[PDB]
Amino acid sequence: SQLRKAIGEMDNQVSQLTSELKFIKNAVAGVRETESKIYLLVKEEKRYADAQLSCQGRGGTLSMPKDEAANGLMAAYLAQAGLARVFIGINDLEKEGAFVYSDHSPMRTFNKWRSGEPNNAYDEEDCVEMVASGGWNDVACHTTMYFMCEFDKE
Amino acid sequence: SQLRKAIGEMDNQVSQLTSELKFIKNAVAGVRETESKIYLLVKEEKRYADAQLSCQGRGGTLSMPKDEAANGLMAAYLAQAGLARVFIGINDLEKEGAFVYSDHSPMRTFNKWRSGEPNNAYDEEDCVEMVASGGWNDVACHTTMYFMCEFDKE
Amino acid sequence: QLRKAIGEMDNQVSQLTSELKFIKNAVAGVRETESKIYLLVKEEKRYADAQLSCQGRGGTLSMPKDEAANGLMAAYLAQAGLARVFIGINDLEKEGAFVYSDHSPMRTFNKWRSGEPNNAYDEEDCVEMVASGGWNDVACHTTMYFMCEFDKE
Ligand SMILES: [Ca+2]
Ligand SMILES: [Ca+2]
Ligand SMILES: [Ca+2]
Ligand SMILES: [Ca+2]
Ligand SMILES: [Ca+2]
Ligand SMILES: [Ca+2]
Ligand SMILES: [Ca+2]
Ligand SMILES: [Ca+2]
Ligand SMILES: [Ca+2]
Ligand SMILES: [Cl-]
C-alpha cells in the first residue's frame, strides 16, 4: 500500500546499507571472516607484547591457527596485502620449548613450523611469526612487525 | 505469512548491520564515543594548523576536553593506543596567555595543566599537547605529532 | 500503530546510514561522486598487481573520463599527501593507442602533462597521476601506490 512506498524505499535503504557495509568491510578494511571468527590485519609495527595488547584493546587476541583452514586463510590474507610476515598468537615465554597459544590453550598435533623451526636462534626467540607462505617461525619478542588479530563471533 | 517472513528477515538484516557496524567502529576504526560526541585518534604526524584542517575536513575539530570526564576518556584513549602525546584543540594563538578551545570558546575554571604550564617556553609555544597521563602542555605550533579529532553527534 | 512502527524502523535505518556515513568519510577518507566511489590504496605495487588488487575488491584502477572525476582524484591525492599514483590508463597492447582499464577508448578529454605521453625509452605503457592532477606515461614495472574506482551498480 501507500506505506509500501515508504517501506519499499526501506527495502532498498536496508539493501543499500548491506552493500556499502560489505564494501567498507571488504574493499576498505580488508577484513577476513569465517563462520565462527573474524581476522584483521593491523599494519602498525609493534613488539609482541604491544601487539597482543592492541588485539585485546579491540576485543580479541593474536590469531591462533589451530587447524589447516585457519592457517590457509591467514596466509592468503598475508599474501594479498603484500606483507612478508606478521605476529601470531603463539609463544613459549613461560617455558622454553613449550609452545602455547595466546589464550593459554596448549599446542597440539597440528603445526606449520618451517624446516628447522622452532630453533630458538641465539636463545632469544620466544614468539612466533607467520610468513607469506603460511609457515611458522619463532622470533625474538622484541622484534617489531605487523600483526593479525582474531575475534570470536560469540 | 510470506510478508511476515520478509519483515522478519529484514529485521534480522537490520540487526546484523547494527552488529557489524559496531564491530567496525570499535575493533577496526578504534573510535571512542560518548552520548554527545565521537573521538578519533589520527596517527599522522602534522603541525597544529594542518591537524585542525584535517579535523575540519572530516567534519569535526581538534578535541576539546572541557570537563574531567572528557579529559579522562581522551587520556585512556591515548594510553590504550600506546601514545606518549597528541595535539588537542587548545591554543593561545590570537592573544598570549589567553587560551581558547578550537571552537573559539574561552578557557574556563577546569584545566589539566601540568605543573608549571602553560609556560610559553622561549616565548614560542602557542599550541597544546596532551600526554599519556592526561595532563596538558603548551608547545610550539610547528611541532609535528599525532592528533585527536572530536565530532558533535548533532 | 503500524505507521508508528514504520516510522520507528525509519529512524533506526537512518541512524545506521548516518554512522555508516561517518565511517566511510571521516575515518576511511574515501571519495565519492554520484555514480562512483574512489579509494586510495597505500600499498606499493606494479600496474598489473594494482589492477588485480582493485578487481579483487570489486572495482578497477581509477578512470578519469571527465574534468570532475579527475579533479576529485587530484584533491584526494593532495589530501593524502601523495606525489603520484597508478591510474586506469594504458597502451600495452598497441603503442600510442591509450585505453582505460575497462578497455574503453581514449577520447577528447585528457590531462596529459606538457610533453606527455612521450613513451620514454620505449618502455612506458602505463599511466600515473601526479599531485597536480596531470597524467604521465611510465614503465609498467614501476612500483607505486594506486587508486581504485567502484561503480555504484
Ligand atoms: Ca629463549
Ligand atoms: Ca624459545
Ligand atoms: Ca627461528
Ligand atoms: Ca608566544
Ligand atoms: Ca603562548
Ligand atoms: Ca610548555
Ligand atoms: Ca611499449
Ligand atoms: Ca607507450
Ligand atoms: Ca612519460
Ligand atoms: Cl623473545
Residue numbers in the entry:
A (entry chain A), B (entry chain B): 116 to 269
C (entry chain C): 117 to 269
Please quote the paper that reports this structure.
Collectin-K1 (CL-K1) is a multifunctional secreted pattern-recognition lectin with key roles in host defence, tissue homeostasis and embryogenesis. It binds to pathogen-associated molecular patterns and activates mannan-binding lectin (MBL)-associated serine proteases (MASPs-1, −2 and −3) to initiate the lectin pathway of complement activation, and stimulate immune and inflammatory processes. CL-K1 is a member of the collectin family of animal lectins with an N-terminal collagen-like domain linked to C-terminal carbohydrate-recognition domains (CRDs) via a helical neck. The structures confirm that the CL-K1 fragment is a homotrimer with the three CRDs linked via an α-helical coiled coil.
The asymmetric unit of each crystal contained two trimers with each CRD bound to three Ca2+. Comparison of the bound and unbound structures reveals no major conformational changes upon carbohydrate recognition. Ca2+ is integral to the structure and function of CL-K1. It not only interacts directly with the carbohydrate ligand but also binds to loops at the top of the CRD. The three Ca2+ interact with residues primarily from loops towards the top of the CRD. As well as explaining the mode of carbohydrate recognition, the structures of CL-K1 also reveal the location of residues that are altered in the 3MC syndrome (Ser169, Gly204 and Ser217). Gly204 and Ser217 are located at the base of loop L1 that forms part of the binding site for two of the three Ca2+. The carbonyl group of Gly204 forms a hydrogen bond with the amide of Ser217, helping to anchor the loop to the side of the domain. Ser169 forms part of one of two helices at the base of the CRD, close to the helical neck of the trimer. Gly204 and Ser217 are located at the base of Ca2+-binding loop L1, so the disease-associated mutations probably interfere with the packing of this loop against the CRD, thereby preventing Ca2+ binding.
